[PDB]
């Protein structure tokens, strides 16, 4: 059987059992081969946007040396839900680098909102993504309002294909200068929240830079990753889910299984 037909069939079963939709886009950067499921359908970003926020901040650092070292002082009282790191460090403030580590690696909402303020807001992050050729990404709101994940609503969405293609440009390619690319990769590689998602489908011990999102409603959650094998070229993978029912929980298992199906089409098995 064609591996792409097997992958499609496995993804369709995952969708039937989950009761919602699974968007996938994978790129094997060795051969250029791809795997796609609902590649151009919109899915809520949830907190996965924070990986792209980090890239946008790094791009701003190109013109202002010292940006990553700049210490931000912020309100404790105004921190949004799920701000564990920014809460802990508020008395000292946090540097822009520390805020990105917290945003990317713990999904700290207060950190992401402070970084959005630093780069001039959701529209400015959207302009940055447009500037690298990503016509799909849009960020409209702050954390946590961006997680509403209402079916069909265009706000705070992208497509699996655009997420994967932009992750390739930014973490592997030339959209950032090499020192900034390396910093973005290092932040993603140190994520702590992804171990039950794409990483659960990747052979043990391979480096994986990823950013998760968990909207908390409408069965909507996701992960995107750059995988660096020791013996083959990197692989980029975006896995996004959504469901029509507001009360549906997300499923880490569905995300990991969809990742396994895509990676199997590239002859990667954990």
Distance between the termini: 21 Å
Biggest sheet strand order reads: 2-1-9-8-7
Integer-rounded radius of gyration:
18 Å
- The counted number of beta strands is 9
Tally the helices: what do you get? Answer: 9
The tally of domains stands at: 1
CATH fold topology: Beta-lactamase
Structural class: alpha+beta
Top-tier CATH class: Alpha Beta
Shape: globular
The SSE string, one letter per element, is: HEEEHEHEHHHEHHEEEH
Could you name the CATH homologous superfamily? DD-peptidase/beta-lactamase superfamily
Largest beta sheet, briefly? 5 strands, antiparallel
Quick structural overview:
Helix content is 39%, strand content 16%. It has 270 residues and is α+β, with helices and mostly antiparallel strands.
Molecular structure report:
- The relative contact order is 0.20.
- Strands 2-1-9-8-7 form a 5-stranded antiparallel β-sheet, sandwiched between helices.
- By secondary structure, the protein is α+β, with helices and mostly antiparallel strands.
- It starts with a helix and ends in a 5-residue tail after the last helix.
- It has a single domain, classed as DD-peptidase/beta-lactamase superfamily (Beta-lactamase, 3-Layer(aba) Sandwich).
- It contains 9 helices and 9 strands.
- The PDB classes it as antimicrobial protein.
- Keywords: class A carbapenemase, Chromobacterium, antimicrobial protein.
- It forms a monomeric assembly.
- The entry is titled "Crystal structure of the environmental CRH-1 class A carbapenemase at 1.1 Angstrom resolution".
């Amino acid at each position: 059987a064609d591996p792409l037909s097997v992958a499609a069939d496995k993804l369709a079963k995952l969708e039937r059992d989950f009761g919602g939709s699974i968007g996938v886009y994978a790129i094997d950067t060795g051969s250029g081969a791809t795997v796609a499921n609902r590649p151009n359908e919109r899915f809520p970003l949830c907190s996965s946007f924070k990986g792209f926020l980090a890239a946008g901040v790094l791009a701003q650092s190109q013109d202002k040396p010292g940006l990553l070292d700049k210490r931000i002082r912020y309100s404790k009282a105004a921190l949004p839900n799920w701000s564990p790191i920014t809460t802990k460090h508020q008395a000292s403030g946090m540097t822009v680098a520390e805020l990105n580590a917290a945003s990317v690696q713990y999904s700290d909402n207060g950190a992401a909102n402070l970084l959005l303020k630093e780069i001039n807001g959701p529209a400015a992050l959207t302009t940055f993504m447009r500037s690298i050729g990503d016509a799909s990404f849009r960020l409209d709101r702050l954390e946590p309002e961006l997680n509403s994940a209402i079916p069909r609503d265009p706000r705070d969405t992208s497509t699996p294909k655009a997420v994967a293609e932009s992750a390739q440009k930014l973490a592997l390619g030339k959209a950032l200068p090499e020192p900034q690319r390396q910093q973005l990769a290092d932040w993603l590689k140190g994520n702590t929240t992804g171990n039950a998602r794409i990483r659960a489908a990747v052979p043990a011990g391979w480096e994986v830079g990823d950013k998760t999102g968990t909207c908390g409603v409408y069965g909507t959650a996701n992960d995107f990753a750059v995988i660096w094998p020791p013996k083959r070229a990197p692989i980029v993978l975006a896995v996004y889910t959504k469901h029509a029912k507001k009360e549906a929980k997300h499923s880490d298992e569905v995300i990991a299984a969809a990742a396994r199906a895509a990676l199997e089409a590239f002859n990667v098995k954990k």
